[PDB]
Amino acid sequence: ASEVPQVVSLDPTSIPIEYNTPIHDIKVQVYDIKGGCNVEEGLTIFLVNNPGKENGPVKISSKVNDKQVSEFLKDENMEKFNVKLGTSKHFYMFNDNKNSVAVGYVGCGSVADLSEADMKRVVLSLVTMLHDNKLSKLTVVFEINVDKNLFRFFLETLFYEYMTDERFKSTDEYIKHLGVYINNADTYKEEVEKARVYYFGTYYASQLIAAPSNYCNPVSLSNAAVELAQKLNLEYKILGVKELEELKMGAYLSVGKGSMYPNKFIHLTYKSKGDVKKKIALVGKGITFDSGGYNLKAAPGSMIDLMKFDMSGCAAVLGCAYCVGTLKPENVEIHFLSAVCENMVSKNSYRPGDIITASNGKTIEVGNTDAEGRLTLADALVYAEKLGVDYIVDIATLTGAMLYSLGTSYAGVFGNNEELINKILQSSKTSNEPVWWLPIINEYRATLNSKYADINQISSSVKASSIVASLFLKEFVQNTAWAHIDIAGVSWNFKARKPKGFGVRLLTEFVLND
Amino acid sequence: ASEVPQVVSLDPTSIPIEYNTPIHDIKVQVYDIKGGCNVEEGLTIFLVNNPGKENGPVKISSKVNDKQVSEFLKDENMEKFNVKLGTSKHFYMFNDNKNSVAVGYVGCGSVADLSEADMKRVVLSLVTMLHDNKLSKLTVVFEINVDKNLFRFFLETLFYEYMTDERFKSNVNMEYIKHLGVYINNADTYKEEVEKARVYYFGTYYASQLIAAPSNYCNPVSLSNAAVELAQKLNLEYKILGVKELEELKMGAYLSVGKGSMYPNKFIHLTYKSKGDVKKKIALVGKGITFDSGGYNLKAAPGSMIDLMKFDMSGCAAVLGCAYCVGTLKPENVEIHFLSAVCENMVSKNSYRPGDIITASNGKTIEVGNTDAEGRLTLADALVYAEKLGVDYIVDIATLTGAMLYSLGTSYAGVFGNNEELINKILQSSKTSNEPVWWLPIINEYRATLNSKYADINQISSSVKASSIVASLFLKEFVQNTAWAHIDIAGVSWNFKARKPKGFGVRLLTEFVLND
Amino acid sequence: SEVPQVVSLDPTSIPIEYNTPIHDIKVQVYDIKGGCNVEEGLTIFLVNNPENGPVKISSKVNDKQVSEFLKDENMEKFNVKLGTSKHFYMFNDNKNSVAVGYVGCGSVADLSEADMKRVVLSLVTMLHDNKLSKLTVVFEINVDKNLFRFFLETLFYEYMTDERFKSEYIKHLGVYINNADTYKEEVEKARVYYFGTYYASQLIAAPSNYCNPVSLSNAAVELAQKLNLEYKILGVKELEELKMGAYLSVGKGSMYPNKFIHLTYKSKGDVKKKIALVGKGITFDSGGYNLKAAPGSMIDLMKFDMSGCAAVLGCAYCVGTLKPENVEIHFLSAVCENMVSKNSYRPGDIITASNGKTIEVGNTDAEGRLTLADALVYAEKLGVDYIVDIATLTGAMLYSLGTSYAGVFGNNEELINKILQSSKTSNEPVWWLPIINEYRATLNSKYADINQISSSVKASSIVASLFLKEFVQNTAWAHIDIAGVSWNFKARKPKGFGVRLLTEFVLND
Ligand SMILES: O=C(NO)[C@H](NC(=O)[C@H]1[C@H]2C[C@@H]3C[C@@H](C[C@H]1C3)C2)c1ccc(-c2cc(F)c(F)c(F)c2)cc1
Ligand SMILES: O=C(NO)[C@H](NC(=O)[C@H]1[C@H]2C[C@@H]3C[C@@H](C[C@H]1C3)C2)c1ccc(-c2cc(F)c(F)c(F)c2)cc1
Ligand SMILES: O=C(NO)[C@H](NC(=O)[C@H]1[C@H]2C[C@@H]3C[C@@H](C[C@H]1C3)C2)c1ccc(-c2cc(F)c(F)c(F)c2)cc1
Ligand SMILES: [Zn+2]
Numbered sequence A: 001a002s003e004v005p006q007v008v009s010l011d012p013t014s015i016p017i018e019y020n021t022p023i024h025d026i027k028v029q030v031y032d033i034k035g036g037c038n039v040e041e042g043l044t045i046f047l048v049n050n051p052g053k054e055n056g057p058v059k060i061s062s063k064v065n066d067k068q069v070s071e072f073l074k075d076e077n078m079e080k081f082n083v084k085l086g087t088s089k090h091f092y093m094f095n096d097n098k099n100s101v102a103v104g105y106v107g108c109g110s111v112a113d114l115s116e117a118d119m120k121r122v123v124l125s126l127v128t129m130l131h132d133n134k135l136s137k138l139t140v141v142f143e144i145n146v147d148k149n150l151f152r153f154f155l156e157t158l159f160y161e162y163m164t165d166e167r168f169k170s171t172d173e174y175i176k177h178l179g180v181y182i183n184n185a186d187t188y189k190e191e192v193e194k195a196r197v198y199y200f201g202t203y204y205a206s207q208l209i210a211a212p213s214n215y216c217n218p219v220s221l222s223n224a225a226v227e228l229a230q231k232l233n234l235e236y237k238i239l240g241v242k243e244l245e246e247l248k249m250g251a252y253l254s255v256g257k258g259s260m261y262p263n264k265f266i267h268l269t270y271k272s273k274g275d276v277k278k279k280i281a282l283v284g285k286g287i288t289f290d291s292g293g294y295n296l297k298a299a300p301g302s303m304i305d306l307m308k309f310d311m312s313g314c315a316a317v318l319g320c321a322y323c324v325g326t327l328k329p330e331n332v333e334i335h336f337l338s339a340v341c342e343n344m345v346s347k348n349s350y351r352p353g354d355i356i357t358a359s360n361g362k363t364i365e366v367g368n369t370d371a372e373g374r375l376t377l378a379d380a381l382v383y384a385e386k387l388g389v390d391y392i393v394d395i396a397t398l399t400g401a402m403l404y405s406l407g408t409s410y411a412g413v414f415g416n417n418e419e420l421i422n423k424i425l426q427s428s429k430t431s432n433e434p435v436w437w438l439p440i441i442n443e444y445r446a447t448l449n450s451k452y453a454d455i456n457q458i459s460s461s462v463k464a465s466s467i468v469a470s471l472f473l474k475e476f477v478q479n480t481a482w483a484h485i486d487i488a489g490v491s492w493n494f495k496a497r498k499p500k501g502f503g504v505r506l507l508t509e510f511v512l513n514d
Numbered sequence B: 001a002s003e004v005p006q007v008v009s010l011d012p013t014s015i016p017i018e019y020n021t022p023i024h025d026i027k028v029q030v031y032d033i034k035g036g037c038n039v040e041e042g043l044t045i046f047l048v049n050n051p052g053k054e055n056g057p058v059k060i061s062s063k064v065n066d067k068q069v070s071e072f073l074k075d076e077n078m079e080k081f082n083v084k085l086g087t088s089k090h091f092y093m094f095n096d097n098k099n100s101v102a103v104g105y106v107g108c109g110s111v112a113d114l115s116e117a118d119m120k121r122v123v124l125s126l127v128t129m130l131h132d133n134k135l136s137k138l139t140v141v142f143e144i145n146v147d148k149n150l151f152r153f154f155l156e157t158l159f160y161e162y163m164t165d166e167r168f169k170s171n172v173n174m175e176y177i178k179h180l181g182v183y184i185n186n187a188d189t190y191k192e193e194v195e196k197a198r199v200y201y202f203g204t205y206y207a208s209q210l211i212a213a214p215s216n217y218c219n220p221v222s223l224s225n226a227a228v229e230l231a232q233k234l235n236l237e238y239k240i241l242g243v244k245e246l247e248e249l250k251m252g253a254y255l256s257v258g259k260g261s262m263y264p265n266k267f268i269h270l271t272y273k274s275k276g277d278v279k280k281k282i283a284l285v286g287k288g289i290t291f292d293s294g295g296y297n298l299k300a301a302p303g304s305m306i307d308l309m310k311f312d313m314s315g316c317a318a319v320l321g322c323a324y325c326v327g328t329l330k331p332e333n334v335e336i337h338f339l340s341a342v343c344e345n346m347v348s349k350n351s352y353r354p355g356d357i358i359t360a361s362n363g364k365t366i367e368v369g370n371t372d373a374e375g376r377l378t379l380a381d382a383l384v385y386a387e388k389l390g391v392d393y394i395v396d397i398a399t400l401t402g403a404m405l406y407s408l409g410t411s412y413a414g415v416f417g418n419n420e421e422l423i424n425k426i427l428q429s430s431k432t433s434n435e436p437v438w439w440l441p442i443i444n445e446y447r448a449t450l451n452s453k454y455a456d457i458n459q460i461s462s463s464v465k466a467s468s469i470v471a472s473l474f475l476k477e478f479v480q481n482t483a484w485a486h487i488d489i490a491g492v493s494w495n496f497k498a499r500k501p502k503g504f505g506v507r508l509l510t511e512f513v514l515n516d
Numbered sequence C: 001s002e003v004p005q006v007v008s009l010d011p012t013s014i015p016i017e018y019n020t021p022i023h024d025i026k027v028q029v030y031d032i033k034g035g036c037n038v039e040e041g042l043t044i045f046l047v048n049n050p051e052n053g054p055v056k057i058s059s060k061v062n063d064k065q066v067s068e069f070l071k072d073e074n075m076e077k078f079n080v081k082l083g084t085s086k087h088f089y090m091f092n093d094n095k096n097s098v099a100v101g102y103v104g105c106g107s108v109a110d111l112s113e114a115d116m117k118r119v120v121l122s123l124v125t126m127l128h129d130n131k132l133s134k135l136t137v138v139f140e141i142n143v144d145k146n147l148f149r150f151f152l153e154t155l156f157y158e159y160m161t162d163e164r165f166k167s168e169y170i171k172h173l174g175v176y177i178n179n180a181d182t183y184k185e186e187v188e189k190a191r192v193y194y195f196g197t198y199y200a201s202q203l204i205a206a207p208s209n210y211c212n213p214v215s216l217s218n219a220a221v222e223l224a225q226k227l228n229l230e231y232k233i234l235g236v237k238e239l240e241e242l243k244m245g246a247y248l249s250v251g252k253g254s255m256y257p258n259k260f261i262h263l264t265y266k267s268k269g270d271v272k273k274k275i276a277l278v279g280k281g282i283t284f285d286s287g288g289y290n291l292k293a294a295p296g297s298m299i300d301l302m303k304f305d306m307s308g309c310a311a312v313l314g315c316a317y318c319v320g321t322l323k324p325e326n327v328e329i330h331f332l333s334a335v336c337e338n339m340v341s342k343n344s345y346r347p348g349d350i351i352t353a354s355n356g357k358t359i360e361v362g363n364t365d366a367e368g369r370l371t372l373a374d375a376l377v378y379a380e381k382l383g384v385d386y387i388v389d390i391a392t393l394t395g396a397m398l399y400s401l402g403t404s405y406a407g408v409f410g411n412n413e414e415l416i417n418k419i420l421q422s423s424k425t426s427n428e429p430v431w432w433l434p435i436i437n438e439y440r441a442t443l444n445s446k447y448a449d450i451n452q453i454s455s456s457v458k459a460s461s462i463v464a465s466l467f468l469k470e471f472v473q474n475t476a477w478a479h480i481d482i483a484g485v486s487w488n489f490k491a492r493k494p495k496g497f498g499v500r501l502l503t504e505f506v507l508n509d
């Protein structure tokens, strides 16, 4: 526990965090469709498609244990509506006990199996039916086929989108029950609490990312990490400047020199109770605010006002810690690392041109102070390898170029080991968090040859910034399977103006399958 | 009717126009709300507020002639929803006769007076519902207060927003209603607003069709042809002036702009004259640049949005849209001239150049400092021509300066003038048309920056950044002794959010003509 | 067709060299087993050391003079750092003046194509600086047959110098290598691949006033007749009848009429695979009214916007020369020029592709995908199994893959894998990038059926891919974006990237 420094007494000294969310009070009940659906209080929504027929008619296939509601939902009545992806309708009628009931459907399109992108659109339509309607219960009937992972993804996304983050509201009700009808209900029931765990890890990462830099700063973010570890029973260590100096983490320390906040290195650990068969280090980039430094983000479109999100990597990692500490995987040991700091303009800031020494002795010539993430990661990666692990995986909002390469939907993965990269890709598939393998092209290595230092921070000629950054990071892992997940493009949801909490599920699937 | 030149045979030779729209098929009935509501058919939507209570619950007061819908509308059920402006819900159910109806509402907030802006939000929320509706009838129940002019705005806005422009497409989820029912206090006073709204709608939709039509469809030849066709449908006098006539009139400023285009300049002159005695002569002048590249001052800078510059003939579109309304409604005692010097501003071996000195048809020489200030050049000759007609009032409408975006923005247009009475009359038309306009000064202190070293006058200023004022000072120099006002709609003409035209100006100009 | 001129001094053809000094080089491969003979010219040893360690030459040299020079103690003074070279003049046993030296091949045992390029360059440097009758190269390293072929191709290509616009070479090449007999058939394959690549380079390097739509399609014709390939040049009257409104719009502003190029190779005998190769052919890209005016848009490079076409024609030369079996190939290119005029198409214009789809033009500098849409409609009407297009399409490739790797997108995994397999055996490196369907919605025009560009999504190369995907209804299709990879910025010349890639793809299938 460290005291957060303030300039005035109105400066915040902690990150407000909501642990007990309304979502956590929702009772979930799954039923097999074979038994028929009961339509009573609340809203009962059918998820319906029509394979191959673009805007085909709605047909309700499930038995509804009610004569009135069954009559209403007959084919002749439904044929006037179509299944176009994301279309929806509210129905109102009285049931057999002369009570009023609300029914409806969401269109799931014409394709037999939904992509995670489509499912997200289905959820968004559903969440629209929940908003602006004081409901006590929602009931969802699956007339579409989903695999278990996508069933879980449906739940996680539902919980995440429905939830509203109101921590910073001053002057400006959720359902209590969720029923789900699906074929083979027993096979899906185990997905429900996993979805709840995954939702909050995701949502937790999002609260830290969305928290502005005056609230979420290196000291308060590491304070939150400690607090998280205590609630979860993880081991933790927070390295302050004095310890970091002794470890000679020159790269990391140089970046934070300019900040009124002292750097804090977060190290959480989860150990299994049984024999440890696999050791892992997860490393998240943790710049709580990235002004660019003396290479100030002043150019049009540099979006300096978004740079609270430059610790999204760290948040994904802490979010993953929540899931792993909760679900408690066996036969594994996990280190959660983040070299947290803040990149500022000051009389004490490191300068463009400065030559700095990393913790492994490699000297680095700084060409651009706005390329700070790779400096902090270099020391975090050296530290990580000294732990003696089997895999190192870093996750980071490293390069703007990711927006020109893969866009806002897929993250990019780089690495030095093919078996590790495929495992990341397998996690991508099962978490439904899209990731694409990109090359580390060695031909570009020579532009990192500094005239004076051992290595250039940046390339003066090569414009493929994501690859060059990966080449730089590679120099700081000597002998361990390593992968890099650049999330600079997928971290923020620009349409909805909120974080995605991207990566938490991806990392946790990786830990679990292993 | 002139022939449209083509580069290849696949180039279009006319602007497609929809004259008959499904809006024109909708039967409109207005009923008095004190009698309660019939809801046995179609879609019934209640417009409701909750004064004082921000985001307050929905309460429906009206008696309805169906027990089922009555139950649905009980306070216990309706209070699960709130009246946040724009928020809507609607449900399908079976009525007393076991027929399918739909019932819902649109929230109108917590304030008893709806702004025009607020009303557009309500209308948009309604239209969203209609775009997923296949029911034959829409019934709108006003449990809020509205006035005759606000109600007519609701109708015009509803019609325009409801109609979609599919001319360049090669729903399956909606269908256009055939009946629209309105329940409102004092139905009989509001009835006459209906066909007026239908007229104002089409004039506005017609302008929008011209504006949205891309510059390979909408060029000076095709636009002048369209105007001729319109004039013939309305029995208007018309004449289109070509290059040789324009040269004889010595329109050097306007002809300079068009030099670099493959399309010959065409000057549009339509006339409406009332059957009775003529007491007021008015000239309506619309800027008609069918595409604005900037010329040699090419629109290359960040934010110059060259891909939207098909809209630089928006002023032309509003004056032709006004001609529809006028020719249809036929006001008495007035003679109105609809003017536009139409051309295209391009980059060619033949284009005029930055620095060129040119001579306007009133003899004034002009030093061109920026070829992208070409609108004021075409207007200069159009203003001279209009003053020659011997009118009492000249009003120009034009997408003239980008600086409107920084002064009034996208909601309010700006009016400048040389005559207070005419300006006051414009501001009144703005009020009753619900097309907002704000009076800005012509500050004479800036005039000296237009003193060219070589020519009679400068086109632009080299110092003053208050563009909109400077361009007005330039225009003023081409109206000698007539009451004149200038409406700058550059900020206001396009609807960025909805990616379509507003057709701004049609109703404003028509109201000015009808109520003066 | 007659090339139009503004002034009498305007050129009316592309100068093309067919018979090059390279084709006059006698190439001979020997097995290292029976020692190496150092009798004339320059002898170069390719050596490594499995880090910047010392040069140790292992092969036996049948000359007392050269052997004492290559003695381990002398050579230790030199290191094997990749790309470094030394070479000394000396007199051999019979008082002949000979030159002996080495090129270091680093410390890793398996060289990438990138390292191999570095070996070849340092080797070519010496050839340029020395009047030699004969180069001998000794391989004391391990290479694939593919990598061996790559060595030659690169050697020839970099050795050759293009002096067509200006106002000596070895006559013999000796190669000593382990298992000589397995590498002998790679020699003339390499010679062919060299010229396919050098030919494409000549067209790319040719400035726009020499290489315009008329003169470029004239050259394709001249190439077709020399190889006896079926050919067909479609002109404006035909393109209009075919209703290619997107492609015709791009060229409306040019003084050179559009020319659509169609060449065909058919193997003698049973044909099992039909293929359409489509190259982007914009002979100069000014950008149109969306003028390349912004810093770093590099308008002076934009003669290179025809690299995809050149790639395809270079491939036609290789396929026309090697005559693979079981295949029918259609080499397509909608050639035109993108210019600023009174006749130019405008941003905001709505135009109609030959399949009926209307397109809203958001940016005239995205002209490539417009011409490609109409080419792809045309290609699919040919009834082929695969459509592969190659294009300098989006500048974003620079920021995703850079100047070394091209990106490939497509609608069929089996075809994409074939392209990737050809990438590895041609040693022209390509990387698979996704077509992300979630971005499709930003091509939903308010007025037309589809947008040419996105106003929101910044993943240009993918959006462009999504756009092209709409013009292939039912055929396996891939798209190779070579914008970042086409021009060699350090050598200030073209790479002619894609010729060998497309040919291996044809050959391996
Ligand atoms: O500062 C950064 N990481 O710590 C990173 N900057 C870079 O990639 C720049 C920096 C470092 C490099 C050398 C040069 C060009 C490139 C690579 C300056 C970066 C990260 C995200 C973004 C970014 C900007 C946005 F507007 C945006 F919407 C977004 F999602 C990401 C831009 C730059
Ligand atoms: O080109 C024009 N009229 O033909 C007009 N140009 C200007 O106002 C500029 C031109 C002409 C001037 C000298 C200098 C500054 C000012 C005045 C360049 C103008 C009008 C509208 C817009 C404009 C741009 C937008 F991106 C936009 F969204 C909009 F609604 C309007 C930009 C420039
Ligand atoms: O002109 C082009 N295709 O015909 C292409 N332009 C783009 O990708 C831009 C164009 C077209 C688009 C709309 C907007 C942003 C994007 C997409 C302008 C493009 C292609 C190559 C390059 C390019 C520029 C360089 F300086 C360079 F060295 C290079 F290798 C390629 C730049 C733009
Ligand atoms: Zn940075």
Ligand SMILES: [Zn+2]
Binding pocket: B292, B294, B371, B372, B373, B374, B375
């Ligand atoms: Zn202009």
Ligand SMILES: [Zn+2]
Binding pocket: C285, C287, C364, C365, C366, C367, C368
């Ligand atoms: Zn271009």
